[PDB]
Symmetry: D3
Subunit: 300 residues, 6 copies
């Protein structure tokens, strides 16, 4: 018996995946979030882990599925797995913006239910709660939210806002930490109601679904819409996400910068764009003027 | 009974990975490479699948491992798995450029041995055939190659050339197909010997290890070196690779284009750059003026 | 006797306006449209004059109103386009069209000019809500042809196709004008929709006009630069031309965004069209001008 | 009678024009120019309305004419700018100015409206050749101040400096307006000259306006983008604004040409000024807007 | 006497200068100009060496002086090396000058021709130029005084003397008509409307104009924008800046011409391309008409 | 007897050259370096004149040879005029060389210093460099032979000899010039190396010089535009300046590549430096000119 004979498909898969193992699980675990700041990690697609200065851990739209695996729409997942859901331990809330496939995940739910404390709430619109209960998440552990609702999870004020009786289907979140606010728009198309939120709230960092729409499809925000969003929200930082995940939606985030450069002076834009990378951290307000993220290079 | 009880870490992994399942395996199998052309797929890192007009399938530097998975170099794999090694059926040759971790793989060796024909050769330098034998690959089924050697796998003429003692450890490949030619530089630094190869051979498409070097390290070629490689090799297309794989080497391939734009006319560059994406197909010479690859949009 | 005493506001206005007088009227009237080509003029806002190789004259969305003229939301709605064409100097005309009932697309004075100065058989083509506006003004109901998405109207060698318009049926229509020279898509003031792709599959489109502009914070009324590119892709056009961005002060946009994005996208997305930055009063000739990228007014020396 | 039958060409014109009506007139009337600042409006072509902190109104090169209105130097020059200001709605004014007697810089109707609607002590300031043209139109002799280079005219709190122009002291002048808020350089329609350096050395110039345009093949009547930058340097200005490029179809130009060259040269040449791309009817305020780079009209909509 | 004692300033100078020696002298002499073409070299400043397919050698504005060499009114230093040795000139068929100004007519060059070359080589220039040549010692019998309108035939090259704009006694412009194509040399002229007159009455292939960064309150050179206007007026196919090489205080960026051309070419339907040359370099019309930028031979 | 026959080739050469005369010599000598600052001049190739606040004068790699002067492996032609006259040098404190190659050491410079300058002026360089100096007749006692690690004090300037890159300790060293006003890295003709990071950590480096150039096909002899930026990061400089690209026609490169690449990477890589494009004969004042990006000759 040699390596060539003993190894099978499953032995390879189960020793290789997820790609990052629990590296980021540990990174988030040991991250000390300074006062007057908040830290966040891009988990792929619209997945965001949020950590407040008080050590509060919040997880939004964390998705661990894949696209097509066979020929038996050619959406192929182009983002690796930067966070193992089954390595999560310290978490204080599990959120979903809407019930679309790649925003809510049974495996994430399964992991939290098996490994984490029983007082972790699952927060989302009715349709997401219906979907969670179906997977076996206890009723009493789910908080249904509508636009207008505010949910206090430790030191994080979660503001449920309008997405675009649809209150049952989708919501946007505004996370208010003692160090800054974060806007998560899920997979919303651009809407004028972004302006409402900008007038009614102080928004620091804002995330919006960027992506290259295939011919005859309007599923993602364009580079021009990302800018309109930042302006409407009166944000300081505008970060594209969702553009990472789907082969057919492969987009160039640099378009947001190039357009921003043409328009910022003329329109008096009060924000900067920021190109992130999946698995990457962001600290507000430290990283607000960085423009472009880079992974840790050296060994410092 | 309920899914938040029946699902385990293990079942989730066995359900989700590799991310593309067998889509690319099936696409490569289905591909009808037209005469006068060759087809090519990027499999992450320096991993290339090549299919000639005569349907000859060749796999170079196919790597199916990962980077760091725990805290106790911060190299994290940033590329998903686009090809299932254990789904490979039709293959004519498995090749490796060198014995470094990122270019040779035990599971790929295992897969080809279990799933494919018994006459499929494992081609690489002495150090590479050693590891293959050590893993369980037959001694006689391996072909040891050094610079100067020429191996003919059906209609593909494989030229083992100089890489950058050394002769036992690393080689560059020039795959001459009837449709065209491909230069696989492995993980070589820039060398003046590229000019020797460009003189002595017709090179159509050239691949070079691109990446953003950390402060105090020279491990990957720069954007300027990519263009110098294209010139020295007298190539018609210059494609970066390797920059996809490691987080800490995350580079911008657009630097190649911008510099090309500045230098092309002055220096009479005979080539064009191409920015590829992992799992993507490239067809010489149909895609030579494309500049940037996009995935099928459906 | 002296000018500072004789000249009045009325005498100045009537001596100066409209700015181009009947220059463009004259130019259109004597333009010899070659066989295999069609020629068109931009009349401001969404207003287009089309002339086929058989000399058929069609007028779409020709607006001759203005913005705000005083301070007494109070929109900073100010017209930033001069009047390139005198409606009352129109003689040769075979059809008068309107995409929708909105202020910027339908005009009383244009209607009056065709009834006073033009043939008694010139059709007023438009949606149900537009003909009700025409008739109410004094247009004979027998002149009007009420069109619906799917309707086709033959005006000599110009084959007019009424198509779907976009907002959130009786209110609005898009137009496709097929000529022995080529086709022209007129989206009016439509938002971007997936149904552009329908039109691109069902018909061949050569030149596509898109309502472009800079949306005020919290408004969505004009298409973005990225939308203009998606529109040209969906319609399988060869030329994409912005319009409507000229007319309103508060919607002042830079058409160069379209080109800059196009340069970034063209190869990766394999666009089969080129953008074209036009100027009001300007003439386009398909396909002579398809690769020009930018229009320039006659320099004349 | 119906609307279609009753409405004539005349009635359409009477209610439609000028395009902006009296909107800008009212904006200028109500504008409370803050101390330490000055406000100015681009009236089209080289037309500038200037309002000091002390409420002094000054109108320079106001042209309410048009180009070719028919086919009939055979020149296809068509007015590409709408009318932003009604001259007949002007009520509060302290002085009417003209740089030179050229067609696009002096207007019979502007003189007529001012003579009819404004106080009889309002001066008409310009070179000899301009006052000759004004006198002929019916403007009294008593109401004109003839200026040659070197002359200084005090109009309330605005020191107006008639400086050298570039093709005769009788024909053309450049103005430097000194307000308590800042200084404004109006070069009229001068081609680039070396004598801008003299003015730059001898005077503190804040905002410089230069006649920009795309010259037709074999004609040299307007400044290039490169000329625009050399002016700002020579004048030692802080802001450099192109004008005159708005008005003529055949002279249609891209102002961004000035910005792009500036981005190539600013560091190497150590430029102390910034370019600013303005729009007709738009207000500029010194020094508040000096760094804005590009103007946009009020976008409105707060709901 | 050792080397640190035997070496003098004068011995070093004679051992080093001119920098290029006779390298370019040798290349011009050995140049096989193919039929239907013409080859030209940039000798520094406005110095042009023309060679027709019939082997005819013409030399325009070849200057071999230098700028300021001490402090005891502009600080003009020569920033160009010497690429051609005037005293190595063998084959020549004409010597031309555009105007009296020092940077365009040379004593040492005139001398070198009178000593090394044929006794029937004409010295063609305006009235003021021949006055200097005669004064220096060139026979009145070998000087062709040209006015705008005059046309001198030198073998297969046809020299058209046209109006200058830097006065018919003082300066002229040249249009060199060869079988292979025409070359417009504008000397040190600034932009003028009379450029259009030359474009209408002749076909211009390559146009050379005096480019430079004008010092504050100085107008002595053409701007990048003026170079394009010249190209348009002359109806050229290739526009090449020169003169911008020679003076420290006039140092300019020829890339301005390219950048502006990129913005304007389509809108103004330019029928020419700009071309950035280097001193000592070779241009071959029409082979190099689409090269945009010259590079020196890299060898090997 | 007139000018056309009295003038010889020697008459022209000895009156015209060196191009700048003693213009730069005078500027250097009259230059009053302010406290907290240092001034330097680019003498062509890798030649640098350096002047501290105390008035010390250091001459590094000053070359006065030239390229090919006739056709009788490469077409290397000097594209730079001579900006300094070695024989006009009076006030000097030290003469330095980085390595023994032709382009970096000159006998005429040695001779001029030996004949015209003080007796106690040391010739500092690697072992092979002092061999050539001794071989040219410079006293053995007057030469300081250096290897990596050695530190030589010259008035207020502390010269640090460091490693050069292709032992090599015989042939080549790199210099760090510590002045009371700031430090200067002179990499000489080194290829890119990781040991730039070593020097970066050990020393504070303010201004960095690197041998930029356009390598011909199949030759790696000069640093690329990307290498220049990498050097800046490794040395942790605040100013990165290309040189050596000026001197050979073969290696004609555009230093703007450094800037363009810098504009793309600076924010992503948190570059703590700026590129500065110099001109031969130009002055640089650290820290006055640190933010300039591009030098221009005095326009006057
Ligand atoms: Mn989604
Ligand atoms: Mn590797
Ligand atoms: Mn509208
Ligand atoms: Mn004028
Ligand atoms: Mn000169
Ligand atoms: Mn060297």
């Amino acid at each position: 018996m040699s390596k060539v004979k003993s190894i099978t498909r499953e032995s390879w898969i189960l020793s290789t995946f997820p790609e990052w193992g629990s590296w980021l699980n540990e990174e988030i675990e040991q991250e000390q979030v300074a006062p007057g700041t908040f830290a966040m990690w891009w988990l792929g697609c619209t997945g965001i882990w949020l950590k407040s200065e008080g050590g509060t851990n919040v997880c939004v739209d964390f998705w661990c599925g894949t696209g097509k695996q066979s020929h038996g729409q050619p959406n192929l997942r182009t983002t690796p797995f930067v966070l193992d859901p089954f390595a999560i331990r310290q978490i204080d809330a599990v959120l979903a913006t809407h019930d679309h496939n790649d925003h809510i995940d049974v495996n994430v739910a399964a992991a939290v239910m098996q490994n984490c404390a029983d007082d972790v709430p699952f927060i989302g619109p009715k349709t997401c709660v219906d979907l969670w209960i179906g997977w076996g998440v206890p009723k009493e552990r789910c908080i249904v939210v509508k636009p207008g609702d505010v949910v206090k999870v430790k030191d994080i004020e979660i503001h449920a806002l309008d997405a675009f009786g649809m209150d049952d289907r989708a919501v946007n979140y505004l996370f208010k930490t003692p160090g800054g606010s974060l806007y998560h728009s899920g997979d919303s198309h651009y809407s004028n109601y972004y302006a409402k939120h900008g007038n009614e709230h102080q928004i620091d960092v804002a995330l919006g679904s960027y992506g290259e729409n295939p011919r005859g499809i309007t599923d993602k925000m364009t580079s021009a819409d990302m800018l309109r969003m930042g302006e409407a929200l009166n944000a300081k930082v505008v970060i594209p996400f969702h553009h990472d995940i789907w082969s057919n939606f492969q987009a160039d985030p640099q378009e947001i910068r190039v357009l921003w450069e043409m328009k910022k002076d003329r329109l008096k834009y009060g924000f900067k764009p920021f190109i992130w990378q999946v698995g990457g951290k962001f600290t507000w307000p430290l990283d607000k003027d960085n423009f472009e993220y880079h992974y840790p290079r050296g060994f410092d």
